[PDB]
Amino acid sequence: KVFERCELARTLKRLGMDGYRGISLANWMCLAKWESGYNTRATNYNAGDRSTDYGIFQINSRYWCNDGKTPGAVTGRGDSPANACHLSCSALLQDNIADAVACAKRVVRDPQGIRAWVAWRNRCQNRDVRQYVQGCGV
Numbered sequence: 001k002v003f004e005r006c007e008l009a010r011t012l013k014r015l016g017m018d019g020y021r022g023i024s025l026a027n028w029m030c031l032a033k034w035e036s037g038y039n040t041r042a043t044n045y046n047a048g049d050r051s052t053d054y055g056i057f058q059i060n061s062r063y064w065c066n067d068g069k070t071p072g073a074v075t076g077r078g079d080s081p082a083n084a085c086h087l088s089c090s091a092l093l094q095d096n097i098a099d100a101v102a103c104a105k106r107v108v109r110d111p112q113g114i115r116a117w118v119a120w121r122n123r124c125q126n127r128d129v130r131q132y133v134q135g136c137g138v
């Protein structure tokens with residue numbers, strides 16, 4: 001699904017993203033915009049490390065969801081960082097963003113917070129992001 005700007009804004013608000021782990025709704029808006037153009041079915045393969053970015057927030061398969069084909073995990077068990085969101089990557093390609101939202105919340109629970117996405121740094125950090133939520137009634 002390709003969300004309209006204010007429609008997404010109202011949806012993220014309802015899903016409790018405003019101020020989640022200190023991140024304003026405008027920053028979440030800035031992130032989705034640059035990551036997918038508000039497209040839930042967006043995917044990007046990284047030839048470089050053999051991982052894929054899924055969905056509206058372009059969540060990577062190396063750490064956050066399982067797609068079975070990305071190299072990198074434990075062989076056996078113990079201190080296991082893989083599929084942190086406990087979801088099939090497919091779940092991040094649905095029109096309903098509840099799962100993508102829950103996963104994005106888990107991502108920012110780590111020290112880097114919203115900095116986990118390089119695009120946020122290049123395109124949103126230290127910028128006036130009010131434009132993304134203006135006139136949406138949020």
Ligand SMILES: [Cl-]
Pocket residue numbers: 086087088091
């Ligand atoms: Cl799933």
Ligand SMILES: [Cl-]
Pocket residue numbers: 066067087088089
């Ligand atoms: Cl799975």
